[PDB]
């Protein structure tokens with residue numbers, strides 16, 4: 356029956372709002388109290404005032420905020436009906452891989468073709484400034500921006516993304532999973548949830564479900580580059596430290 | 606209205622049984638099948654440091670518990686109509702007070718029900734621990750003995766725990782008016798329920814409102830201990 360899921364879709368929006376303070380809705384407003392834009396070396400030196408080299412400072416900046424994003428997605432995951440009940444060793448597995456795919460989804464919410472929100476929306480930072488960095492980091496965030504723009508085209512809601520965020524973490528198709536059946540069953544309901552939500556919220560985006568499920572192809576492909584790229588920067592610069600929570604995931 | 610109150614009582618009760626798989630009725634039934642843990646040796650058998658592993662299962666369950674509490678607060682009339690920030694606050698603080706209340710329904714003098722009922726840890730086993738954990742649950746056991754002496758049923762608890770949840774004095778509530786507004790309602794319902802289901806028990810109502818002073822005691826003191834437990838996985842620490 357519908358109300359089964361309609362109400363499940365509600366439970367998850369409400370947790371979504373309660374777990375991530377920068378929503379797609381809040382970003383879209385501040386991308387159309389305006390952000391301080393950074394598009395040059397010095398505008399970064401203002402960015403300190405207003406809100407080791409730059410490419411390394413700015414990389415370590417992506418890392419702190421991601422340690423706090425991983426915090427946010429754990430909080431959200433606990434909320435998902437079933438997840439807390441599952442095997443403990445697999446909870447840790449689902450997050451270990453389920454995190455990054457979530458990140459570059461929420462990322463897209465903060466992105467347009469031109470750049471990316473920063474410091475909780477306080478600032479903006481160009482897609483072309485980023486390209487113009489130090490040899491390893493001049494390619495740090497480029498495919499993100501590419502996928503951001505194709506992914507954002509579906510023009511998803513927050514309420515949509517909350518169920519899709521759910522489906523992601525509860526994969527089953529993940530490496531190291533002892534009990535796969537109960538994961539895959541939670542997801543059968545989340546997919547069932549998601550299906551009706553895309554019909555109702557976006558009644559024109561025909562095969563939006565299909566076209567959304569399709570973007571999990573793009574998403575892993577992104578994670579793969581980030582991993583081996585992230586793996587380089589350790590060899591280039593063993594001076595750099597990583598946060599242990601980020602270590603675990605990686 | 607004498608009839609409205611009897612309605613809130615039932616809506617709350619009903620939601621409570623859906624919300625909580627293991628009732629105090631059937632937890633009492635069990636207590637008088639369950640695999641007991643009384644030795645170290647029973648333990649390594651029932652699984653199929655050691656002081657650490659036991660503490661940390663209390664953890665995994667304590668987090669399952671939280672979720673079924675959040676599910677249950679949903680059905681409290683107009684709970685959801687509250688400011689979402691305020692919902693988070695009420696749950697955040699009340700959750701612990703309701704865990705020991707429900708941990709009473711699993712406890713008797715000599716130990717506590719385990720694994721959603723399939724087990725029984727001796728109270729004397731629990732007492733027989735290391736200084737970091739050898740009087741961990743000892744305080745708890747005294748609360749539940751005195752608490753269970755009020756012979757509340759789940760019909761009463763289901764109204765009682767709703768009231769814990771909406772206690773309007775929590776740190777950081779933004780709009781306290783409706784929070785107390787509902788609590789006034791659940792109080793009015795709990796009065797009628799205690800006076801109906803136990804007309805023999807005089808001032809039971811008054812006596813339940815004092816154990817809430819105990820609950821706030823046992824919860825700060827437990828807080829105090831899970832920071833003393835910080836004087837002895839990164840992704841898992843974050844889970845808890």
Ligand SMILES: O=C(O)c1c(Sc2ccccc2)c2cc(Cl)ccc2n1Cc1ccc(Cl)cc1
Nearest residue numbers: 402403413416417420421424458472473474475
């Ligand atoms: O501090 C920040 O919030 C920040 C930073 S770090 C920073 C912020 C202000 C001045 C200097 C550095 C960042 C760096 C990149 Cl290359 C991309 C996004 C960044 N952000 C925003 C952000 C980072 C990660 C995620 Cl998952 C979402 C938003």
Ligand SMILES: O=C(O)c1c(Sc2ccccc2)c2cc(Cl)ccc2n1Cc1ccc(Cl)cc1
Nearest residue numbers: 658659662663666667670704717718719720721
């Ligand atoms: O998973 C359980 O059912 C359980 C546990 S979990 C456990 C069982 C066997 C060995 C180690 C941990 C538990 C531990 C303690 Cl020191 C006290 C009560 C405990 N329980 C009963 C319990 C029921 C509910 C909640 Cl909120 C917390 C604990």
